[PDB]
Design a protein around this ligand. Structure first.
Ligand SMILES: Nc1ncnc2c1ncn2[C@@H]1O[C@H](COP(=O)(O)OP(=O)(O)O)[C@@H](O)[C@H]1O
Ligand SMILES: Nc1ncnc2c1ncn2[C@@H]1O[C@H](COP(=O)(O)OP(=O)(O)O)[C@@H](O)[C@H]1O
Ligand SMILES: Nc1ncnc2c1ncn2[C@@H]1O[C@H](COP(=O)(O)OP(=O)(O)O)[C@@H](O)[C@H]1O
Ligand SMILES: Nc1ncnc2c1ncn2[C@@H]1O[C@H](COP(=O)(O)OP(=O)(O)O)[C@@H](O)[C@H]1O
Ligand SMILES: [Mg+2]
Ligand SMILES: [Mg+2]
Lengths: 86, 445, 48, 124, 438, 251, 418, 126
């Protein structure tokens, strides 16, 4: 069956100890060692209204903001967009 | 520390390099013979080759016995353990008196442990197995190392580790971009969160995102930890941190001192000896100060004989201001210092004498300097005259009320009138006793 | 090796018409305590 | 192995301490030790004094119609009876008054210590 | 480096210093003088070593400083670690957790050791190769193989699931010298025969190696388990008794438990399973016991599990604690009939000088002959313990002045600095009003 | 102090005082030898009796919904609320319950046909048996069958109950309930009287003053009668010196 | 066969031996003589049974070996098991678990009982067939006169599963609780005869102490068997007293005042006596009966001397019953009664010798010598105790007087003589 | 001084106990948060639902419930012993909490004596 073999040997240098791990199938090898690429740094979003670094994210508009006035302006703009496009 | 206590001016024993006591040094005035004897005792403590030796400070009250003991403690330093204790503390509702005495004895014997802690910090940048071109058994892939890349503020290093660490890595759920640390002495990986550079302002995790480690990837330092035998004994008698039902009961139940057995103490002694032989630890025998020894009863003194006869005991300092008093716990048995003659045969007696008026004036001046009080020469002489009668403690206790009265009056120094007014306002023990005797009918009992 | 000479279950309280809420409450308390504490008592199995 | 002791008693004995709810007052208005670990100094001192409900707000919210449905995210009388309705509105008024009184009663007490103090003073 | 055990009062006593005929030498193994008392102690020691008579009581009586505790410590050191020696003070039996009779019973039963001797099969060898194969996913049967080596053997072992789990928990690698007990399956690592691979990182400094074991792989070794009667009582009293072995807190052990344990130990002794190693209980200052404790001792010495009891007291005709009755040594006559009394005579000048010489040898202090004469005169005038303390005091004073040999001036200096009981009492009489009460 | 020869009527005079005061005034009779407790110090016994003598009168209207359960339906959005149907001899009422009450209903094992009551102010649920109309649904069940409640489903009663400061002290000395493991293991611990802290006494005094200012509480100082006071020792008398000088003590 | 209750010191006492006019008989119900004490005890018994006056206290005072405890045992026997009779010694109130006042309060409350009658349905029969299917089930039970099938509910199914019940077992079920107790198997107990389902009236007499302990805490009834009561709060006791008063007013329960007997009450200290002084003044106090043989003696805990070791304030609340020493005729009659109790046959000369011995030394010494003489007679294959056997046991076993004389002969050999 | 988030819960979505989103609002603001494993566990343990008014400590993540918002659908006839209706907080979702209190040394000793030592500050069984 699909097994992982742990092996420890005695080999000459006068002798040293070495350990080996043997995977029966490549699926297990990929699962234990996905070789994941390094993650990406998220983009520091900025409030379109006040240009300050963003701290919030209005769920309705998905527009990040950093001020209550910015939130009110965003909601007013969304209402105007709804009225226009309908 | 910022508040000024009664022995805040004692910075040690004012001894010359030859052991002779200077007339006034390190906050101590007079008591030259007692200071020289205390210096000999300090050398004995530093020699670390004697156990169970006892010294009794005997003298009238207010003669510097506690001050001398604290000077000894200052001379030894913070490295040497110093466990103060009053005789009234042996009467406990939880453990027997002999257990209290034994616990304080073990508190006085310290142990200093020196170890090197080597760790590898960093953010995991690379996780690549080192396969072998000849798979063992013919099928599959075999790996001989796992390359882990660790990134810190001022460097990046790669560590070729044992393949067996793959299981620890999977158990800790370590992935790329996570901050981990590996301990050399154990070969284990612990995930101390994820790097903060991958966290956004819209995340809500609290203990998940951690800053990128500063400094080098390979950090090693020498850790010096000071412990006492009583610490190990108590930590082993009522252990904290287990997940069994007994640890849960210990957490639930009200904590209570218990009679630690000789088996546990012998095991602790064996472990300490093993550590010393390995070179990890160095024994630091300190001092147990038992003030008001006369408050101990006959049972405590009898146990103290065996306690002092032990080869593990610290150096014990006693103090008693009693004369030919009756030992507590006995019916009409009188001993020269409130201590049975059997225990007095086991101690070295240091005599503290009364202070001459000049020494009293010097002590008053030193106490005024310590308390930040400026006192005029005439006021100082008047206060020394007050101290010739009454006691020295009364004079050193009139300094701060007089300073307050001067400050209220608008003066930066104590004059004679302030001392006179304070003396009028406050009575001493003798004046109060005279008042009580003159009106014994009007008082109660 | 020491065994008690006698072994008995705890005394039980019986009434003809008990409050119908006491028994379910006691049962739930015992069940929760057992579910929370029995795994922690496994090391003492050989002693028991 | 012995059978247990079956202790039989009168069924009336097991109800000696029981008191009907209509015959006892609510002791939770004096429960100070129950508040520890649950109520904070912030809740008692800053939040509740500012955001306590009023009868006017409660009545306004109850009488007002249902709020409009939340917008979806965007990536950017013959059978009428007057007495029955009077009874129903009296019941609604009583319900609102009860809600107000219970909300006031359940947040009247301030903790002796509070979560913040205990957390600050609790060493590892 | 200084060990946890340092120079104490009786650190120079390594034994009673007797010959084959129990004739005391004048000065041997630290003991000086007390010839009759040492001979009596040697006879008692032979009685203890024989271990045939239960509940024998001996009283060491004499003036203060005559070597009663020295004789007790010499007996303890002559017994050796194999035979139990429980030394307690009389004050220790007064406890808020247990009764006086319970404390005395525990003290007695800490002085009797039960030893169980059994033979077990043991595998000791150098790991050459260990292989463990486990399923990739889900519960399955791990299969493994282990190779062990000695100087004259090498065998390949097929491993079961539980041995696989034990080896996994112990993290056994190649080159580890391991011990396997076949019955219980316990594995104990005792070293590494060689280093691990150098190319690995984060491994730490390699310690010293251990030579590979010789002889056959699976040997047969004798395993000895020794506990006292008190330990059996504590671990059988309740489930938490094993923790009570270290925390105390045993309360009062039921008499039923102790009776069951006595019966079981007698059965084991008859069935050759266990051997009883009776020891000694030493109660220093037995005069602090009250009448109830003495009455309990009276009948507790009549058991066949009782050890040899050795008491020390320096009291004359004194009131017994808890009563208003005057008795010799503070002990009731009913108990005084059950015990043999060993008297200690005071020391002469030459015995005192020899004791001082032994103490100086123990403390690594070099002293001149004139200093020895002065110190012996002081010890005769004041006390032996005062002279012993002045030994170290003068050593320190001499070392302070950058000297090498303790002279008469150092002894006079420490005599001036530190006072005996007599001079302290004189100076207190001179200032009687200054001291507080009477 | 009532001082006189034996048989002269000191206890009778104290009981006459109690009768004159009425059952509304707390009269706590104690014997001087009752301060020698084995659980708390003597001064603690004295202070407990002092707080027992001080009484507090609280006026409150309690609301209880009582009747046979005809329907038990939790409404999912988690559960927003629980709709319950209670039946009595005077009609049927439909009640909306706070979702936290659903846990209590599930613990009490409340099903259709069970007779329960719910406290409006606390949400406590007690399942007081099955309705006797269902007594014949099986020939042999281990059930306690209870009559259907007679009055209305919604019952209101305005009550006046007298409590003493000691009742509030002992109510706040130990926690009640608690689903944590430590709380459950504490329920098994033997109930022992404890030296209640002065901090707790002062906090309870503050709570009492707050509710008095609100107008829902009234104070009845009451009387503590100590008979055979000569059985108190010197420590008790010395503590009485301070306790009587308190501005909170009773007569 | 030897049961637990063997022949004791008062096993022959079966009552007070009084007629309807409380006039004592010379010998009746194991009691001989002491006409005045028995008449007073009968009056006190009438007072106890009337139940109107609360907290009445009686002291039985007299010389050692004058029937005080015998009178108390006769009073206990004349009352049935229905009325509580708590018998403790003065030493028993000294406890490490509770205070002395708490011990006396629990002693008092153990002496007052609450009689509650309730009706229950009990099903007793032989199991024929039990069926459980995945919950529903059926159970068929039979008596010797009728057979029935029951439709089981979930709770009864669980109860019958928990207590293994199989065909042929004879069990009784409490319908309301599911309490199933197996009383044997039949093919060993005979199958029940009458109706399968019986409505029974069960009467329980529960003491106030039992109510307090049951309602003190959850699982608190266990403290009725293992001590561990601690000190029950006065609030619980007041609540229980109020609820018991409510029950009495509503007719749900009846109060059965009983008797607390404190033998050797002189062991009580001044604190206990002061507590009893006011504990007797409650309306829930039982009748307290005490016995002491002390003359003018120091009160424990004080330095004052009192006629019975009891302070005069408590003595003012007591009625004292004085017991007089027995005559030759009464002593002989008591010896005959004890011989009949122990199944010992003596000659008339043996009875005369034993009566002379009892008069010269003590009644208890002669009562003790009866059994020793019987054993000595059985040793020599005899059937009736003779004067020779009595002399043999007199020589073998000493009394207090001869023991004191012999000790005074060798007073130096004994320990701590004063 | 501690930074906290304070608002009324609008929606809790948990995808499959692995990852989820939480929406909080004030009278002048509303935002959505990304949750981790421990945050999801803490939210499920406290049974936090919609309409609840909660505060979250940024440093430790502990959640304490102040109350719940009142809506026309929450006109309960019976209320639990701990639930109480409070107004939705105003201002900004992120807030700083300053707490000043006076305790004695003995109180800190009792707090740190055992696991639940603060109970002894009421019982006195120190
Ligand atoms: N020789 C001294 N030099 C300086 N300060 C002293 C001296 N003797 C006593 N004092 C101070 O005066 C006060 C007297 O207390 P102390 O003499 O220590 O009491 P006791 O005599 O009981 O030890 C102490 O606060 C101490 O610091
Ligand atoms: N005969 C002896 N040989 C060697 N050392 C002795 C002898 N007698 C006494 N000592 C030493 O003198 C010191 C005091 O004697 P100790 O035995 O304590 O007297 P006591 O018999 O009163 O206990 C101890 O340190 C002990 O080692
Ligand atoms: N003035 C009185 N009028 C009526 N009865 C009295 C009077 N004084 C005392 N008594 C009765 O005498 C008995 C004993 O009096 P008591 O109250 O015990 O006095 P004290 O408390 O001083 O010992 C009580 O039962 C009481 O009812
Ligand atoms: N009047 C009597 N009738 C029958 N038996 C008696 C009588 N008096 C004493 N006895 C018996 O003689 C023994 C004497 O005990 P008792 O007189 O009760 O001692 P106390 O004086 O302590 O009450 C008891 O066993 C009792 O049963
Ligand atoms: Mg000694
Ligand atoms: Mg009697």
């Amino acid at each position: 069956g699909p097994i992982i073999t742990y092996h420890s040997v005695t080999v000459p240098l006068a002798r040293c100890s070495r350990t080996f791990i043997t995977f029966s199938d490549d699926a297990t090898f990929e699962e234990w060692f996905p070789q994941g690429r390094p993650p990406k740094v998220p983009v520091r979003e900025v409030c379109p209204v006040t240009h300050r670094p963003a701290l919030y994210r209005d769920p309705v508009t998905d527009i990040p903001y950093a001020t209550a006035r910015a939130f009110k302006i965003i909601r007013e703009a969304y209402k105007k967009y709804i009225t226009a496009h309908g | 520390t910022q508040r000024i206590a009664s022995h805040s001016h004692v910075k040690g024993l004012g001894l010359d390099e030859s052991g002779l006591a200077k007339q006034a040094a390190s906050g101590l005035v007079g008591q030259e013979n007692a200071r020289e004897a205390c210096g000999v005792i300090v050398e004995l403590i530093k020699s670390k080759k004697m156990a169970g030796r006892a010294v009794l400070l005997a003298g009238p009250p207010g003669t510097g016995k506690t001050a001398l003991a604290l000077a000894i403690a200052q001379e030894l330093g913070s490295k040497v353990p110093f466990c103060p204790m009053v005789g009234s503390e042996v009467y406990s509702t939880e453990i027997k008196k002999t257990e209290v005495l034994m616990e304080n004895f073990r508190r006085a014997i310290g142990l200093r442990i020196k170890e090197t802690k080597e760790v590898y910090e960093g953010e995991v940048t690379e996780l690549t197995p080192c396969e072998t071109e000849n798979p063992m058994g013919g099928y599959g892939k075999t790996i001989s190392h796992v390359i882990i890349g660790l990134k810190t503020a001022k460097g990046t290093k790669q560590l070729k580790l044992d393949p067996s660490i793959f299981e620890s890595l999977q158990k800790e759920r370590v992935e790329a971009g996570d901050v981990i640390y590996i301990e050399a002495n154990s070969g284990a990986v612990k995930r101390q969160g994820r790097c903060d550079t991958y966290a956004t302002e819209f995340d809500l995790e609290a203990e998940e995102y951690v800053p990128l480690p500063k400094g080098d990837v390979h950090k090693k330092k020498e850790i010096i930890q000071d412990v006492t035998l009583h610490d190990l004994d108590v930590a082993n008698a009522r252990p904290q941190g287990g997940q069994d039902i007994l640890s849960m009961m210990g957490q639930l139940m009200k904590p209570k001192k218990t009679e630690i057995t000789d088996k546990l103490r012998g095991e602790i002694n064996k472990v300490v000896n093993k550590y010393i032989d390995q070179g990890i630890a160095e024994l630091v025998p300190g001092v147990l100060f038992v003030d008001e020894v006369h408050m101990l009863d006959i049972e405590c003194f009898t146990y103290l004989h065996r306690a002092l006869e032990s080869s593990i005991a610290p150096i014990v300092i006693f103090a008693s201001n009693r004369g030919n008093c009756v030992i507590r716990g006995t019916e009409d048995i009188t001993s020269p210092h409130g201590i049975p003659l059997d225990l007095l045969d086991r101690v070295m007696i240091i005599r503290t004498m009364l202070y001459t008026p000049q020494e009293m004036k010097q002590i008053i001046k030193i106490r005024a300097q310590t308390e930040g009080i400026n006192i005029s020469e005439e006021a100082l002489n008047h206060l020394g005259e007050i101290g010739t009668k009454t006691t020295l403690r009364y004079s050193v206790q009139l300094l701060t009320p007089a300073n307050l009265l001067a400050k209220i009056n608008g003066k930066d120094s104590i004059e004679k009138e302030h001392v006179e007014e304070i003396s009028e306002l406050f009575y001493d023990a003798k004046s109060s006793a005279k008042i009580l005797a003159d009106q014994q009918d009007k008082y109660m009992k | 090796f020491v065994m008690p000479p006698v072994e008995a279950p705890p005394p039980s309280l019986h009434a003809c018409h008990p409050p119908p809420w006491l028994a379910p409450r006691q049962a739930a308390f015992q069940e929760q305590l057992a579910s929370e504490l029995w795994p922690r008592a496994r090391p003492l199995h050989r002693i028991v | 192995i012995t059978p247990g002791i079956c202790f039989s008693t009168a069924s009336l004995v097991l109800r000696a301490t029981d008191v009907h709810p209509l015959q006892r007052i609510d002791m939770g208005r004096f429960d100070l030790i129950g508040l520890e670990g649950r109520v904070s100094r912030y809740e008692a001192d800053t939040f509740l004094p500012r955001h306590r409900l009023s009868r006017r707000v409660l009545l306004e919210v109850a009488t007002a119609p249902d709020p409009p449905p939340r917008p979806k995210p965007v990536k950017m009388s013959p059978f009428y009876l007057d007495s029955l309705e009077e009874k129903r509105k009296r019941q609604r008024s009583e319900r609102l008054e009860r809600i107000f009184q219970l909300s006031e009663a359940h947040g009247a007490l301030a903790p002796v210590y509070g979560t913040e103090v205990l957390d600050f003073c609790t060493l590892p | 480096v200084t060990r946890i055990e340092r120079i104490g009062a009786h650190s120079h006593i390594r034994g009673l210093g007797l010959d084959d005929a129990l004739e005391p030498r004048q000065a041997s193994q630290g003991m000086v003088g007390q010839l009759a008392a040492r001979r009596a102690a040697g006879v008692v020691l032979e009685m203890i070593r024989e271990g045939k008579i239960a509940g024998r009581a001996v009283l060491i009586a004499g003036q203060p400083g005559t070597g009663k505790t020295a004789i007790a410590m010499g007996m303890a050191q002559a017994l050796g670690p194999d035979t139990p020696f429980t030394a307690i003070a009389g004050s220790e039996i007064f406890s808020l957790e247990m009764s006086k009779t319970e404390a005395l019973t525990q003290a007695f039963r800490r002085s009797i050791g039960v030893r169980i001797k059994e033979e077990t099969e043991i595998i000791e060898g150098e790991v050459v190769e260990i292989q463990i194969d486990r399923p990739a996913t889900g519960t399955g049967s791990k299969v493994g193989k282990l190779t062990l080596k000695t100087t004259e053997m090498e065998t390949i072992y097929d491993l079961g699931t539980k041995m696989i789990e034990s080896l996994t928990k112990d993290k056994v690698q190649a080159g580890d010298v391991i011990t396997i007990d076949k019955a219980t399956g316990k594995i104990s690592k005792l070293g590494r025969s060689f280093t691990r691979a150098r190319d690995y990182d984060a491994m730490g400094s390699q310690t010293k190696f251990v030579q590979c074991p010789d002889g056959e792989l699976q040997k047969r070794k004798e395993v000895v388990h020794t506990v006292s009667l008190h330990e059996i009582d504590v671990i059988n009293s309740r489930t938490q008794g094993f923790l009570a072995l270290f925390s105390g807190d045993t309360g009062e052990i039921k008499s039923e438990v102790r009776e069951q344990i006595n019966a079981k130990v007698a059965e084991w002794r008859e069935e050759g399973k266990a051997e009883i190693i009776p020891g000694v209980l030493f109660i220093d200052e037995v005069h602090m016991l009250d009448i109830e404790s003495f009455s309990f001792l009276n009948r507790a010495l009549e058991s066949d599990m009782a050890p040899v009891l050795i008491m020390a007291t320096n009291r004359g005709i004194t009131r017994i604690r808890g009563t208003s009755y005057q008795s010799p040594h503070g002990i009731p006559i009913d108990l005084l009939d059950r015990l043999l009394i060993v008297s200690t005579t005071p020391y002469s000048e030459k015995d005192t000088k020899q004791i001082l010489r032994i103490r100086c040898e123990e403390e690594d202090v070099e002293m001149s002959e004139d200093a020895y004469t002065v110190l012996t005169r002081i010890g005769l005038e004041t006390s032996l313990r005062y002279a012993i303390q002045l030994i170290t005091a003068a050593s320190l004073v001499c070392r302070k002045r950058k000297g090498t040999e303790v002279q008469v001036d150092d002894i006079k200096r420490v005599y001036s600095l530190f006072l005996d009981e007599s001079r302290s009492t004189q100076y207190m009489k001179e200032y009687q009003d200054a001291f507080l009460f009477n």
